[PDB]
Design a protein around this ligand. Structure first.
Ligand code: HEM
Ligand code: HEM
Ligand code: HW5
Ligand code: HW5
Ligand code: H4B
Ligand code: H4B
Ligand code: ZN
Lengths: 407, 411
């Protein structure tokens, strides 16, 4: 019932009790581990509300106080009456920070308590959503000195009036299917790049076209907006030693900003809640640039390096991979845009693990996601046992809105 | 029921029904996933059902389920259990069983090879000298002057738990580690404690960086005994780099034969506590883990120093750069000396093909993603993008506690 996690490099053992406050189900059983699968009423609401406010009042050292009991009744009153309730500003801020703190797949949670929360619950239209989003981008970008933030649109009501950002991230590059048969730009976004065009967007049809935002207020048809280019910080990619690297014509954006998730606080659902931090180098240089079904640039780079590409065992893919990732880090650093390498990030997360065990009784962690996609075993998280479980408040996946929207 | 796994690079979707034949526990529940946890005397009562499940599987595999021969063998095993408390496997059942423990090993990326396994039956063995002889023969057969062949040697099963056959070595061939008074280590740091056991048992330690450890062998629950493998039987490879001529001067070498000797083989409820098996290496086991863990040889600094990498900031990726050069060196050296090795690209590609064939012909393939994905360059190998189901089939290999923890010393 109390579970231990060992670090095999340091022999440090931590004891996990936080898992017993676990609520939702993992996907695993006693017979099958599902650890590597990407996606495994008034009556329901008050328990959920109570559980949250209980931890809220505990956090501000006021568990069992008049104020605690008072608010528990006010919320109970409001649910019995309206079928929902509203969070106090303070509860919203605490819930958002905690959803991040509970994200078992996020290596960057050492930062969880520095999060700027933008309350957009007063928003009513897509133009409104656009204004809120530009302001988030500008704030968070901070001319290259990136700052974490989330903007929270109005909560679900009857589920026929959802606020949704249709983009998967606030800033992403377009993908187009070519007659040719190959793909121009980012193949991840082909479908969406079409939906934008199937709605009037004028595609420059380049390798790196910043997608328009596609915004849905109150369950209405969504609308297109170009983000002002002066608000999209981008970095040209060059290598500190290979003069030819620049001629690849690669660039990436400075701000990672996930916009398709659902934030759950105290039973309430915030279906539009874009949030942003700063990149770990490998996200761009390993995944965005080198995945088979992403930009897939390994061959081109290997060639320019004149490596022996005739056999897998020359490790030419591995050599090219390192150089590409050196380029990404060097570039962002040179243009003074915040970035972290996987060494410093995983080291940070280990420190964060020790803090959460020391201070909260544990830290839910998903090893499959936490371990970087390159050089796994020379980063300390490789050797660290982790326990994965689901705590609330949380971020959750949700079906892409086009599959669902009533037009 | 039916479960789906998707490959997110290819969109290929596979259906698992084999997990319905799973018995043992994973360690996970609906409320916690223990997927990254490293380690998560029987009675007649429990034995005949376990015998029965196993023989139903053997007999279906040979298309004689329900045969007279199947039924007579059930009755025969039944009777042997009630009369003697245990039973003996026929040669054919033993072979089949050891192959399936390998087939079912969900942490093993090499399983495409599962059906080509040389089985050596050492169940007539009685003494530690007998074990030494059996192991030498295994090592010579498997080595095959560099053209590695997979093999397993199987010593008598557990009886009462007081008479166990054990190989005390974690692998048949490994290098000594020696803790020095100044707190530094000579040789392999993983093997310090075991080296100390060997020394106190009477081993005269050469005390260099690559001293092949003696075998410590326990027969029939008796105190274990020391033996030196004839050095002409221990194939080793000096490590050099195709472009870097200073690489050889680091003084590195490794052995060709990876041979796990500390696991337990369970077949139809029988427990074989000494069952050394061997295959051939994936280069990253040596180049990433053996040489580059901080708790192992830890050569990253020395290598990057010679490479003149910018070592002042991790963001130069000096570690990543050196790591790749060491792994190039390992594969180059083995290939140049004609010792079988596979790179992590070719081994993970073979595994996806094996895994898909297994879904098509068997209804599933249990696989542990934490173990299957290589410890460098993970996402450029096709396994990274492969959804996997982990579960426990028997026959199987299992961990067992190190025998210096449990053994009752006799003298
Ligand atoms: C401050 C710098 C941050 C770093 C370096 C970072 C790091 C990462 C990384 C590397 C991933 C893996 C993503 C992938 O591989 O596709 C990830 C996932 C995630 N992060 Fe962060 N993060 C940061 C800030 C944030 C913030 C501000 C939030 C929310 C407030 C957040 C919440 C999440 C969530 C929910 C996931 C998993 C999403 C999913 O399941 O697809 N992180 N994080
Ligand atoms: C033929 C070449 C083989 C290759 C390339 C190979 C590859 C590997 C690798 C890389 C590992 C993980 C090692 C680690 O990370 O420490 C492993 C684990 C394992 N393999 Fe193989 N393997 C081979 C043959 C075999 C054979 C012959 C058997 C037994 C019949 C076997 C059974 C196992 C088992 C039981 C594990 C898990 C060990 C543990 O949990 O500590 N493999 N395999
Ligand atoms: C706030 C933040 C900071 C950071 N450094 N990285 C991130 C993650 C961002 C940046 N890189 C990928 C993106 O993660 C989004 C999740 C990607 C997973 C793929 C995926 C998820 C669901 C369905 C599907 F088909 C694919 C977020
Ligand atoms: C038959 C076979 C073939 C092959 N290529 N590799 C292997 C695995 C071999 C070769 N390299 C590491 C070794 O695996 C050892 C397995 C045990 C895992 C290590 C381990 C487990 C618990 C605590 C600990 F400190 C270490 C076996
Ligand atoms: C199948 C597997 O679960 C999938 O490929 C995962 C593996 N680990 C990951 N880890 C991170 N950080 N991001 C990912 O997209 C993935 N993909
Ligand atoms: C804690 C974690 O489970 C442990 O370090 C695992 C991770 N994956 C591994 N994978 C392989 N192949 N070998 C290992 O020793 C490990 N170690
Ligand atoms: Zn699990």
């Amino acid at each position: 019932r109390f579970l231990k996690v060992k670090n095999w490099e340091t022999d440090v053992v931590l004891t996990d009790t936080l898992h017993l406050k676990s609520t939702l189900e993992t996907g695993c059983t006693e017979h099958i581990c599902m650890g590597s699968i990407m996606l495994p009423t008034k009556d329901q609401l008050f328990p959920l509300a109570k559980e949250f406010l209980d931890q809220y009042y505990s956090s501000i050292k006021r568990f069992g106080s008049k104020a605690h009991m008072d608010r528990l009744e006010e919320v109970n009153k409001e649910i019995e009456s309206t079928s929902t309730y509203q969070l106090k500003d303070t509860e919203l801020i605490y819930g958002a920070k905690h959803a991040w703190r509970n994200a078992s797949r996020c290596v960057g949670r050492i930062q969880w308590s520095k999060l700027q929360v933008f309350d957009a619950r007063d928003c009513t239209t897509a133009h409104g959503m656009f204004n809120y989003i530009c302001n988030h981008v500008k704030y968070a970008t901070n001319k290259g000195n990136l700052r974490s933030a989330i903007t929270i649109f109005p909560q679900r009501t009857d589920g026929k009036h959802d606020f949704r950002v249709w983009n998967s991230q606030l800033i992403r590059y377009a993908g187009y299917k070519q007659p040719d048969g190959s793909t121009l730009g980012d193949p991840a976004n082909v479908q969406f790049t079409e939906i934008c065009i199937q709605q009037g967007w004028k595609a420059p049809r380049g390798r790196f076209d910043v997608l328009p935002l596609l915004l849905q207020a109150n369950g209405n048809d969504p609308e297109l907006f170009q983000i002002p280019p002066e608000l999209v910080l981008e970095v040209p990619i060059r290598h500190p030693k290979f003069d030819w690297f620049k001629d690849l014509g690669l660039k990436w954006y400075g701000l990672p900003a996930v916009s398709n998730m659902l934030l759950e606080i105290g039973g309430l659902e915030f279906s539009a809640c874009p949030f942003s931090g700063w990149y770990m180098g490998t996200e761009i240089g390993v995944r965005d640039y080198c995945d088979n079904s992403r930009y897939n640039i390994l061959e081109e780079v290997a060639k320019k390096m004149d490596l022996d590409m005739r056999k897998t065992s020359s490790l030419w893919k591995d050599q090219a991979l390192v150089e590409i990732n050196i380029a990404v880090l060097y570039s962002f650093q040179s243009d003074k845009v915040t970035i972290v390498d996987h060494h410093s990030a995983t080291e940070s997360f280990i420190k964060h693990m020790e803090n959460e065990y020391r201070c909260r009784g544990g830290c839910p962690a998903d090893w499959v996601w936490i371990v970087p996609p390159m050089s796994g075993s020379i980063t300390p998280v490789f050797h660290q046992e982790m326990l994965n479980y689901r705590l609330t408040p949380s971020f959750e996946y949700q079906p892409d809105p086009w599959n669902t929207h009533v037009w």
